[PDB]
């Protein structure tokens, strides 16, 4: 659910502001059919134009920037991660309706749900860079692990207190 | 798409009279004459083949009619409807025209 | 240039595995109701197979943000498999005795 403002900056490599100055025309940046582009995962919201003076060792340069606003389209990731993780959580819930005497059945269901959740977690981050902070997807998948784990621990506790301990 | 792209046009300056009506000449002289600046509007990093020599030919008829052919591999955009995928069908364009010269 | 996609690859490769997974899930209705671990294995393995197929089906396409016909087919097959598992859950809920017929 992230939005970004991607820049495109240009200036003069050698001529500082005292030698070359840039100006935006009245019709600065034109676009055609915006929503027919190759932005598969993103939607173009708009754009804007800016001018600035940037100091460097060689001098001060007039940098002109065009920012494009892109809002992520969440449908692909809904198909890829959110729906499978929820379905595996519901699969874990199905164990509660199985008879508690079906020990191999319920244990296999719980552990297989925890396997599929690990698999979905690792597939979730394939499209992203290796950032070292939690994202909303990581949080969702992580809470889904606690739910599938807690279900397995619930059955383990129930079995131990019903049969093994007594 | 791999194409022989042929363009022909009149040039009164290149009229001549000689033993043969058509001069099938080396492609290096094509740089020494005017040729149209055709480009592909929806192209994406096309390549002009140059093995062993530049794959072009230029021919000048006695009446000043020039023929000029190039060998290209054109990589062109083709926007797609993927809602009927894999039952989908497309109409990929190939659009070209002059860059600098208006109608 | 008008192009039509050939469905044969996807028929061999995605639709047939999904159909056979659905048939495999439906096979569990013919086992006795007391084979609880066996029918649970059927349901769970079919659900995970459908999840894996859904994940692997989208690798061919670019990451577009809308559902395709293949996506709808996979979703319906997943619904069928999960319905089979819920059916077994109901059958086991209404099963009384933990032993099968002795013969």
């Amino acid at each position, epitope marked *: 659910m992230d939005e970004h403002s991607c820049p495109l900056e240009f200036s003069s490599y050698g001529y500082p502001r005292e030698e070359i100055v840039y100006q935006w025309k009245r019709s600065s940046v034109e676009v*055609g059919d915006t*929503r027919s582009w190759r932005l598969y995962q993103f939607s173009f919201v708009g754009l804007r134009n800016t001018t600035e003076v940037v100091k460097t060792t060689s001098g001060d340069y007039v940098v002109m920037s065009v920012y494009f606003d892109l809002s992520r389209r969440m449908g692909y990731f809904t198909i890829q991660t959110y729906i499978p993780c929820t379905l595996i959580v519901v699969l874990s819930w199905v164990s509660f309706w199985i008879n508690k005497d079906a020990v191999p059945a319920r244990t296999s269901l719980g552990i297989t749900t925890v396997l599929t959740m690990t698999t979905l977690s690792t597939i979730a981050r394939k499209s992203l860079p290796k950032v070292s902070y939690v994202t909303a997807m990581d949080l969702f998948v992580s809470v889904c692990f606690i739910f599938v784990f807690s279900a397995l621990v619930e059955y383990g506790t129930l079995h131990y207190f019903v049969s093994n301990r007594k | 798409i791999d194409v022989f792209f042929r363009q022909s046009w009149k040039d009164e300056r290149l009229k001549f009279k000689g033993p043969m009506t058509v001069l099938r000449l080396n492609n290096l002289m094509a740089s020494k004459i005017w040729t149209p600046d055709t480009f592909f509007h929806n192209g994406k990093k096309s390549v002009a083949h140059n093995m062993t020599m530049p794959n072009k030919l230029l021919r000048i008829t006695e009446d000043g009619t020039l023929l000029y052919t190039m060998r290209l591999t054109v990589r062109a955009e083709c926007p797609m409807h993927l809602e009927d995928f894999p039952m989908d069908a497309h*109409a990929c364009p190939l*659009k070209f025209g002059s860059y600098a010269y208006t109608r | 240039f008008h192009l039509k996609r050939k469905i044969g690859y996807f028929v061999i490769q995605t639709y047939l595995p999904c159909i056979m997974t659905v048939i495999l899930s439906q096979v569990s209705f013919w086992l006795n109701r007391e084979s609880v671990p066996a029918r649970t294995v059927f349901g769970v393995t079919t659900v995970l197979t459908m999840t894996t197929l859904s994940i692997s089906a989208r690798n061919s396409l670019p990451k577009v943000a809308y559902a395709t016909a293949m996506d709808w087919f996979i979703a319906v097959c997943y619904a069928f498999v999960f319905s089979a598992l819920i059916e077994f859950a109901t059958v086991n809920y209404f099963t009384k005795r933990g032993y099968a017929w002795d013969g």
Partner: nanobody
Amino acid sequence: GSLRVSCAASGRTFTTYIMAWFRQAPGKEREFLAAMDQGRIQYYGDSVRGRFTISRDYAKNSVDLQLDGLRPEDTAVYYCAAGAGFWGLRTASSYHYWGQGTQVTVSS
């Protein structure tokens, strides 16, 4: 005289369509008039070349047709079509969306 016929659309994520205009005179025949691409390329029929000009507002999702040099033979009902040009871009069968249509008449 001069006239302008506008045609607006909405209710779709689908964009990649050519948008075109067709004409029906008394006699039940469809006549392609103009079309505009996603690349802003304008195709025109030979009969109405240089007279009618097509344009598209992509943000508003509309196609406009400015009609100039009208004559009595131009009286007809005009239909707006939008679709992907498959085997077409000049034949009506390639467009899967059509409008109600608008009448135009010239009186001398």
